[model samples]
Target: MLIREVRVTPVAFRDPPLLNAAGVHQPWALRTIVEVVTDEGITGLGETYGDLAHLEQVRAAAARLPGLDVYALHRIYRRVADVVGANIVTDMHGLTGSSSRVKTVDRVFAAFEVACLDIQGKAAGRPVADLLGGKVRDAVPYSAYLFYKWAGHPGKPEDRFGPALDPDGIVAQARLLIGEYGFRSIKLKGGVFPPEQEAEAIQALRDAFPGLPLRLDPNAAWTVETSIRVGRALDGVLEYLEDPTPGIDGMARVAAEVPMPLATNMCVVTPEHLPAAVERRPIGVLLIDHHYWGGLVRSAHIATLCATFGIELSMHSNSHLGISLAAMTHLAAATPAITHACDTHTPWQDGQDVVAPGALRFVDGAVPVPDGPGLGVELDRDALAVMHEQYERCGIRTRDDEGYMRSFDPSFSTRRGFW
Candidate 1:
């Protein structure tokens, strides 16, 4: 089927001030909705980051889609590059070496890839999982993605999401999430507190839910020594220690001494990262994020490559809606290398969605594969319109965690190991 139409829309959704390595999340998370229509009158959907730069690139990529077949992704990527010309974004280097991410092109390309997959799945009357290969499992398991956060914003009124700044609060947070979602695995996003304190929080979670698979990700906010110490302390407790230190070399040092498997999405993000990172013997588990790797097809290739290299695969997540979640579930269902339950922000965005309800549901900490053709999810136009209006008024087209933190603490810095 040849592409006949392409439309892109920016949507804004309410985001709680979840604490992360960079600082607090902004009030609104932004994303782009990509709709691709084939000449046969089938429409496919994709979602992506709403930051202006990436959005611009996504639109440019859309212009290249009208005449191309869904399967001509290689040619599409080349032509898409002709429009953006190898888009690459380099963030400021911190104490943890250059925090460089080379997925600008993939980030833009991912939307199109996802759109194509959706179209292909519908055309073939198969789910995206079958398009990937076939289902290894009926339902894909996910972890309870916990985070440190205020009750609401700095000065905003109270909300249902209560505060979680300490061990007790974090335990309460875990209990609430696990209670609601029936999650068997727990992942705490750390790096906002002292190492010992965060360690105590993990212990609290362990005390609360013994035998649950636990994971801690500090986003490389520690020195190698501290990373080793923390990794050693939480070795038996964590399923894996994620991004404890910074660069591949630093993570290699930490991995050499720590007893737990070191996992990363930060260090080994791109294809070029694998050569040096794999030879260094650091990462045991590679977090596969389809948005960064380009698309579901490319992500599966990464899973295959990681397996070939004797490395494990798991999924990573960002704050997103149901369309991405459906895509994630399909990817995990098809890829056998994703041995562990994937991480997700679904709980955080529990009520906000651009897709129709029932498309994304967590039962016993897992989402069942959609049985119908394509993603088996339908977009909610009214919801999309509301969110689009929010985007127009939110005045947030980019993510600026460090900038948001400055509102509370004027002295906050983006340097690594600051926690």
Candidate 2:
């Protein structure tokens, strides 16, 4: 089908003070929702980052996509690349590692690519998973993504999830999440506290859950030596350790000594990073994030590459709504290489979403593949308008976790390896 129009709407929703290596999330989290309409009135949806710079790139690229066929993904990639020339949009939080021009184009192209795929699936009257070599699983498992945070943002009343500053708080938070969501696996967002304290939190979780799989992602806040020490200390206590140190070199150093597999969404992000990472054998698990890994189809290619290299697969996340969750579920369901339960920020979102409900649900910690054609989720126009208003009034044009954290603690620094 021929492309007709591309609508890119930036939206904001309330976010708790979830702590991470970059710092705490702001009161509002940003995302860009895309709708690609074809000449025949068929439409598809895609979701992605809402940083101001990235949004500009998305807008520029969207302008170039009005006449191409929906299935011309390679042509779409070329058009996006032409618009994103020479510009490398680095991760503002510095959590997702280095950036390049290719990565930037991939990020912009992904939103459109996913929408196009949704259009394709809808046209064929099949689920998005069916188009990706058919689904390997009926349901996709997701990990309970835990975050250390304040009881409430300053001057505001307590949010639903209370403080999680220490080991007890973390475990309590986990219990609240797991009790409600039935998540069998947990991933703690670390680097907010010292390695020993965060490690103790992991121990507490291990003691609390007993049989559930647990993972820790410090977001490359630790030094190579500290990563090895903490990784060794947590032996048999973790499902995996994610991004314990900064770069490929640092990750390789730590991976050489850690008992469990070292995983990353940080060190090895783009295809260029893949060859070096495979040669170095730095990461045992590669986290697939279609928002930047191009889209479902390209992410599938990444899964295959990881499998060929014997590197396992997992999925990464940012604060997202139901559209992203649906996309991730479809992608994960079709890919057999992703053995570990994927990460998701749905619990953190706490039900604020632009998508109409009932298409996505967690059954015993896993999201069943949406049985409807395409992504099987529709945007709520009223909710979209409300969130867009929030985006306008929220005054956050870009995500600056370090800046937000610095507002409260002047001494706070995002310096990697500070520990």
Candidate 3:
């Protein structure tokens, strides 16, 4: 089938009470949605992380995409990438600007890839996973993120505090995840808290859970010297130290000095970044966030490369909703190198979901692989309408009446809003 039409929709939702993490409070969630239509009348859905600025770009780019063989999805992605250039594919952390220009390019590319894949899969009566190669496992294991002081329970002030290194809180969160959620592994957010406090929290969790595998992410909040000093001190305790130090050179230093495994997420965005990182050979596992990596195909390519380098692969989370979460689960299941558990937690909303009803369901800390065509989850039109209505009523629109998109605050604008 030949390509016919492409459309982009921007969606926004507000946080009930302004929430804070590491001294920052975000009141709303802005995402980009892409819809693609083909000559045979089949439709495909895709999404990306971005706000109004990115949405406008995606809409404009989608308008220019048509008249190509719909089945050649990869070539369609190449076309978009060629126009958008390496800026979109290489800048996954959203560092370029708040315009979400890079992110929108990613979504637009992903939308077409997913559309073509869906069409091909349906015609052949196979799942997208089957088309990509085949499934490595039927289910993918998941890891839970414990609350630092930022989650805002009772004593916290709007949850604005840094990592909750309090022993009680750390132990409590771990227990609940293991006992109630059936999680086999968990990660603690560090770097914001004092090193002593961070180490204490890690020790506390290890003491409470005993054999539970534990990981820590500094989120590139530390220097190489500090990471080495602290990581070596916690030797034999942590499963991995994630982005303890930022750049490839810094990470390499830490890997050489620290005893524990070095895993990274923020640095590995696109294929271009991989050569330098692979050359450094500092990290053992690569954390892949599908949302930022231009969706499934690009992420799969990264996974394949990491496998060749003998690096483990894991999916990073943006607190994604039903559609993206389901897509991630299937992608993780199909990739052979993705042995580590995944993360997807957003406690702020009681149960706010971006996708329509019956889109996805989780049980015992695991989401099942989709069985039908495409991403395997059908959109619930009624549920999506309800969500959109609630979102509009709550004043969560992306732009002001003047049509100016919201810009990131200076304090949080560091690193070009890539986080």
TM-score, every prediction: 0.96, 0.99, 0.82
For 270-342, candidate 1 gives per-residue lDDT tens digits of: 7888899878977899999997788898899989999999899888998899889989999999998988999
Q: Please write out the lDDT profile of model 3 over residues 1-419, one tens digit for every residue.
A: 77688866555554322211223324556566566777877766676654554455566667767888766766676677666654432222322212244454665576556656666666677777787787888876777776554454233245322334476767776776566557777787665456677788888888877776788876666777888888888899987887776678888888999998888766665556678887887688888876666767778888888898888887677544566766677788888888888876644343566555454555666666777777776655565566556546545434221111113233432221122
The TM-score leader among the candidates is 2
- Model 3 spans with C-alpha error above 4 angstroms: 14-25, 82-108, 149-165, 346-350, 356-359, 389-419
Better of 1 and 2 by TM-score: 2
lDDT tens readout by residue for model 2, 167-194: 9999999999998888999999998898
Between prediction 1 and prediction 3, the one with superior TM-score is 1
Q: If both were scored by TM-score, which would come out higher, candidate 2 or candidate 3? A: 2
* Count of backbone clashes, every candidate in sequence: 0, 0, 4
Ranking by TM-score: 2, 1, 3
